[PDB]
Curated annotation (Swiss-Prot), chain A:
Organism domain of life: Bacteria
Membrane topology of the entry: Peripheral membrane protein
Protein name listed in UniProt: Energy-coupling factor transporter ATP-binding protein EcfA2
Signal peptide (UniProt feature, chain positions): none
CDD domains from the UniProt entry: ABC_cobalt_CbiO_domain1
Gene Ontology cellular-component terms listed: ATP-binding cassette (ABC) transporter complex
Residues holding ATP: G31, H32, T33, G34, S35, G36, K37, S38
Known EC number: 7.-.-.-
Role summary: ATP-binding (A) component of a common energy-coupling factor (ECF) ABC-transporter complex. Unlike classic ABC transporters this ECF transporter provides the energy necessary to transport a number of different substrates.
Assembly, per entry: Forms a stable energy-coupling factor (ECF) transporter complex composed of 2 membrane-embedded substrate-binding proteins (S component), 2 ATP-binding proteins (A component) and 2 transmembrane proteins (T component).
Species of origin: Lactobacillus delbrueckii subsp. bulgaricus (strain ATCC 11842 / DSM 20081 / BCRC 10696 / JCM 1002 / NBRC 13953 / NCIMB 11778 / NCTC 12712 / WDCM 00102 / Lb 14)
Presence of keyword Transmembrane helix: no
Domain ABC transporter span(s) in chain numbering: 2-236
Gene name of this polypeptide: ecfA2
Localization per record: Cell membrane
Swiss-Prot record, chain B:
Assembly description: Forms a stable energy-coupling factor (ECF) transporter complex composed of 2 membrane-embedded substrate-binding proteins (S component), 2 ATP-binding proteins (A component) and 2 transmembrane proteins (T component).
Biological function: ATP-binding (A) component of a common energy-coupling factor (ECF) ABC-transporter complex. Unlike classic ABC transporters this ECF transporter provides the energy necessary to transport a number of different substrates.
Organism: Lactobacillus delbrueckii subsp. bulgaricus (strain ATCC 11842 / DSM 20081 / BCRC 10696 / JCM 1002 / NBRC 13953 / NCIMB 11778 / NCTC 12712 / WDCM 00102 / Lb 14)
Superkingdom: Bacteria
One Gene Ontology MF term: ATPase-coupled transmembrane transporter activity
Listed name of the protein: Energy-coupling factor transporter ATP-binding protein EcfA1
Keywords: ATP-binding, Cell membrane, Membrane, Nucleotide-binding, Translocase, Transport
One Pfam family from the record: ABC_tran
Annotated compartments: Cell membrane
Length: 273, 279, 169, 261
């Protein structure tokens, strides 16, 4: 699991985070801008150490006096994909760029190549664009190459800061389904996002932050249960939730909680029958 | 009548085999909000640079871009860039000044506006967007929505006739996109101007007066949002995610609940389900 | 001769040089600053003359936003200008070669760090030239070889971007 | 580490940055003139009068001195052992500590102190944008060589506006590479030198993107060159700027008169 035991960070800041994310779920990390989502994300792989408290992630204890050695095996298991992760592309070819991570984490040149080729197939990159320069690709292709570079060494836990931002709707759907398949294969996906439709569609657990404190840790149905609480705590609903609220305001009784759009359509159909 | 006129443009984008825009011909009506939607390779990324003259069309004899009666040539680009102001995509990559007031003043310094008039105009434009309390703030201390507000203020300070929002909200959080669109709407009907949106956000295009649809450099289809978004298969096959109301109507139609195509916004769908629940 | 796009790129490389001059590498015994990397980008991408201008302006910018640590003296501005000019004499519009990297780092070390920066220290602090040199000889007899190795790998990194679509020229 | 300015309300903060930067340069020039103990005493009283007239605490000056205090003492001891003369204390094979050596070491220590103290006042007591404006003002006599000074000022202003942005980008890039296994502080010489490409190449790619975007935005907003433009942010002289010229003319007279020639 990922246990945070009274975790704080100062100098954008965290204050007494207590949660236990279980292994194998799709966790959404929500909250307003500046609520400390990026700080918590960087705490997941000890880029930032806590000022007080313990982190139990991937069999590793992270403490305020945690050194900078032994983080290679932590970062081999816990991977972060930063926002605009295509910025980090630097290598001569696409394949060398993807296998930079595995070769960093002790993969052999044969193992890193096979891992890179598998994950370049998985992120949906064309086979001829392998051995091209990373700077000669399109924006979506560079995003896919960056996502393959952080998934090639098969991390146990992957933390994503807006991984499908600014993408084709089919490309956005394909990336979110890539992460859903990756979680369905036995891994933990943490999605730091401001979108709420993907939180409704894919997340099993939701971490809500507000000014650096954990304000809710529940399923998306329980997080989006009441609209007053989210508006008070600077959180948005999915559009299906807002439309269900507009239907209840009119007076249509909707069975279940319609967080997604097919669920909302099914609720409208059954509410008409 | 029409403010911007494009007739038969081609841009081959400096080695590229295929032209990004191919025989493109549209007109932008004066005083309207027109949205250009399309895929990331539809050619709409070059339209704003073509309108203000930063890019030239492939053949000047057979192409014609007229802005407010002023044809674009190599010489009239500065007459056009005082009519057209573009808000670009990245908020801090268009933030040229050291502070908010210095960034808004940049376009006025280019026009050699005298400094006291410049001070009054900059203060008024900074107060026009919601940024009067941040006039001395460096861009490193601003959010993307605030820097987009400063970009809109700097464009607005020099009194243009057209604002072009070229993917302006595409790097913002959802709470910033709403604020920027509301601000641009307030600015538009407070300054009697035309807004052109190049966007992949189709909730922005749903509020437009006109929607131009681009597909591989061709003007695919044209019209109001209430007659662009009901045709769902075309926007599906050109890789465009239709707004919430229209894909909800599509899901309900796939579930047997047929709804008229003249429902354009969500409350209309609320009543359209109310009377169908009433019967 | 330099368009607005190249002017803004020169400002970016000046900013990069300032940021890299704030960076250090190596263990606690051996700290090597990274500003020579910005000197090499200034000389490699813009030539000797715009490299000279960029080095002088980078000294001014770094003095503005980090304080000019040595003092406030235009001799250090001249030295910071002269570095990228030598890198532009040796590396601008040239194929990447071992001898060019070695010779450029030697010429920058001898002309700027060993020779002229020692002259400014002896002029400012009133000491003899040999006293300033002995105060500075040990770092500048170790850092040239580290700089040669680093500059070598910088140049294929800068080359693979110049051959990419991102480089407009 | 970006911000070095510490706010205050003393008259030094009201002095024009052109006057303060000229006073800094002139104080370096007057430090060149100090050779005997009377001139070093005069330049020390003037520098300490400036420092006490800023009203700052001694800790900001100590932070200014801290990085090169070992360079200061090494240079001071090297001047102690080279220009030795007169008395002898603790004599060695070549090393000889002397009275003349100790006063020469004191002289070079005083010079290091007065250089650093006055330049720390320049950095701390005026805002970086104002220092940039003063430098643009001092590059004005380069117009005699037909050097485009407005172009230089534009390059300087863009570089200053984009140092914190590209520093955030550098830290972000390094964190993104470290997350997938990069070490920027281990490995030996070749491994360390290869490790700066994962930092520099994304930085140069980002700089190219920013340069294209910013030049596009500037040309969209009507920037056709530095000529024919007005200025929004001006520097204005005032009566408090007569204090630096009285401070510099009085220092000049005592420098010329009290030095041994």
């Amino acid at each position: 699991a990922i246990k945070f035991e009274n975790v704080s960070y100062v100098y954008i800041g965290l204050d007494q985070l207590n949660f236990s994310l279980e292994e194998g779920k799709f966790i959404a990390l929500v909250g307003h801008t500046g609520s400390g989502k990026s700080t918590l994300m960087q705490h997941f792989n000890a880029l930032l150490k806590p000022t007080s408290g313990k982190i139990e992630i991937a069999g590793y204890t992270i403490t305020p006096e945690t050194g900078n050695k032994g983080l290679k095996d932590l970062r081999r298991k816990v991977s972060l994909a930063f926002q605009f992760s295509e910025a980090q592309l630097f290598e001569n070819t696409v394949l060398k760029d993807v296998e930079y991570g595995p070769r960093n984490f002790g993969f052999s040149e044969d193992e890193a190549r096979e891992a890179a080729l598998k994950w370049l197939k998985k992120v949906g990159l064309k086979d001829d664009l392998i051995e091209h320069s990373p700077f000669d690709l399109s924006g979506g292709q560079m995003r896919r190459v960056a996502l393959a570079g952080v998934l090639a060494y098969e991390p146990e836990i992957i933390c994503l800061d807006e991984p499908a931002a600014g993408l084709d709707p089919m490309g956005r759907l394909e990336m979110m389904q890539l992460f859903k398949d990756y979680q369905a294969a036995g891994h933990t996906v943490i999605l730091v996002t401001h979108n709420m439709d993907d939180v409704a569609d894919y997340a099993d657990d939701v971490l809500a932050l507000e000014h650096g404190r954990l304000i809710k840790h529940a399923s998306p149905k329980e997080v989006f249960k009441d609209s007053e609480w989210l508006q008070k705590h600077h959180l948005a609903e999915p559009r299906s939730a807002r439309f269900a609220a507009k239907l209840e305001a009119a007076g249509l009784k909707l069975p279940g909680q319609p967080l997604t759009m097919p669920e909302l359509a099914d609720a409208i159909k059954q509410s008409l029958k | 009548g029409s403010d911007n006129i494009i007739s038969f443009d081609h841009v081959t984008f400096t080695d590229s085999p295929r032209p990004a825009l191919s025989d493109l011909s549209f007109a932008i009506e004066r005083g309207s909000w027109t949205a250009l939607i399309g895929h990331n390779g539809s050619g709409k990324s070059t339209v704003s640079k073509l309108i203000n003259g930063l890019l030239a069309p492939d053949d000047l004899d057979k192409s014609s871009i007229t802005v407010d009666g002023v044809k674009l040539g190599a010489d009239t680009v500065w007459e056009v860039r005082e009519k057209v102001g573009i808000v670009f995509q990245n908020p801090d990559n268009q933030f040229v000044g050291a502070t908010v007031s210095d960034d808004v003043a940049f376009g006025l310094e280019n026009r050699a506006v005298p400094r006291p008039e410049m001070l009054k105009i900059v203060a008024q434009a900074v107060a026009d967007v919601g940024m009067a309390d941040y006039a001395d703030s460096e861009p490193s201390n601003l959010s993307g929505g605030q820097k987009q507000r400063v970009a809109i203020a700097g464009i607005l300070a020099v009194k243009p006739q057209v604002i072009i929002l070229d993917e302006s909200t595409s790097m913002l959080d959802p709470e910033g996109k709403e604020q920027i669109l509301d601000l641009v709407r307030k600015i538009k009907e407070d300054n009697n101007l035309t807004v052109i949106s190049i966007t992949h956000d189709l909730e922005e295009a749903a509020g437009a007066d006109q929607v131009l649809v681009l597909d591989d450099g061709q003007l695919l289809d044209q019209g109001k949002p209430e007659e662009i978004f009901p045709k769902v298969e075309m926007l599906k096959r050109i890789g465009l995610d239709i707004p919430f109301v229209y894909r909800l109507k599509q899901l309900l139609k796939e579930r047997g609940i047929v709804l008229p195509d003249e429902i354009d916004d969500d409350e209309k769908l609320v009543q359209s389900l109310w009377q169908l629940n009433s019967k | 001769k330099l368009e607005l796009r190249e002017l803004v790129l020169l400002a970016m490389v000046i900013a990069i040089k300032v940021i890299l001059g704030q960076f250090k590498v190596g263990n606690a015994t051996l700290q090597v600053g990274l500003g020579f990397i910005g000197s090499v980008m200034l000389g490699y991408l813009f030539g000797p003359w715009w490299g000279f201008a960029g080095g002088a302006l980078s000294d001014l910018v770094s003095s503005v936003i980090f304080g000019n640590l040595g003092g406030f003296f235009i001799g250090f501005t001249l030295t910071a200008a002269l570095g990228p000019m030598i890198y532009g004499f040796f590396l601008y519009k040239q194929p990447i070669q071992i001898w060019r990297v070695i010779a450029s780092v030697i010429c920058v070390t001898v002309i700027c760090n060993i020779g002229l920066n020692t002259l400014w220290v002896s002029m400012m602090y009133g000491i003899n030239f040999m006293v300033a040199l002995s105060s500075r000889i040990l770092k500048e007899m170790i850092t040239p070889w580290i700089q040669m190795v680093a500059v070598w790998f910088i140049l294929e990194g800068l080359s693979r971007v110049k051959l990419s679509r991102k480089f407009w020229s | 580490i970006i911000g070095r300015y510490l706010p205050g309300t003393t008259f030094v903060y009201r002095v024009d940055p052109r006057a303060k930067l000229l006073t800094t340069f002139y104080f370096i020039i007057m430090i060149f003139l100090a050779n005997n103990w009377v001139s070093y005493l005069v330049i020390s009283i003037f520098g300490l009068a400036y420092v006490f007239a800023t009203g700052l605490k001694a800790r900001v000056f100590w932070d200014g001195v801290k990085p090169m205090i070992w360079m200061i003492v090494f240079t001071s001891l090297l001047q102690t052992f080279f220009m030795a003369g007169g008395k002898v204390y603790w004599h060695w094979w070549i090393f000889t500590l002397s009275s003349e050596g100790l006063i020469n070491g004191l002289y070079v220590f005083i010079r290091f102190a007065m250089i650093i103290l006055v330049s720390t006042v320049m950095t701390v007591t005026t805002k970086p944008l104002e220092i940039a404006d003063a430098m643009e003002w001092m590059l004005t006599p380069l117009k005699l060589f037909k050097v485009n000074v407005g172009m230089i000022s534009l390059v300087i202003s863009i570089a200053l506006r984009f140092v914190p942005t590209l520093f955030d980008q550098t830290v972000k890039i390094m964190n993104a590479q470290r997350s997938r296994g990069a070490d920027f502080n281990d490995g030996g010489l070749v491994k360390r030198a290869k490790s700066v490409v994962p930092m520099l190449v994304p930085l140069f790619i980002d700089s190219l993107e920013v340069a294209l975007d910013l030049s596009t935005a500037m040309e969209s907003r009507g920037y056709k060159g530095s000529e024919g433009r007005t200025r929004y942010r001006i520097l204005e002289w005032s009566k408090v700027d007569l204090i630096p010229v009285a401070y510099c003319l009085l220092l000049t007279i005592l420098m010329i008169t009290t030095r041994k020639h």
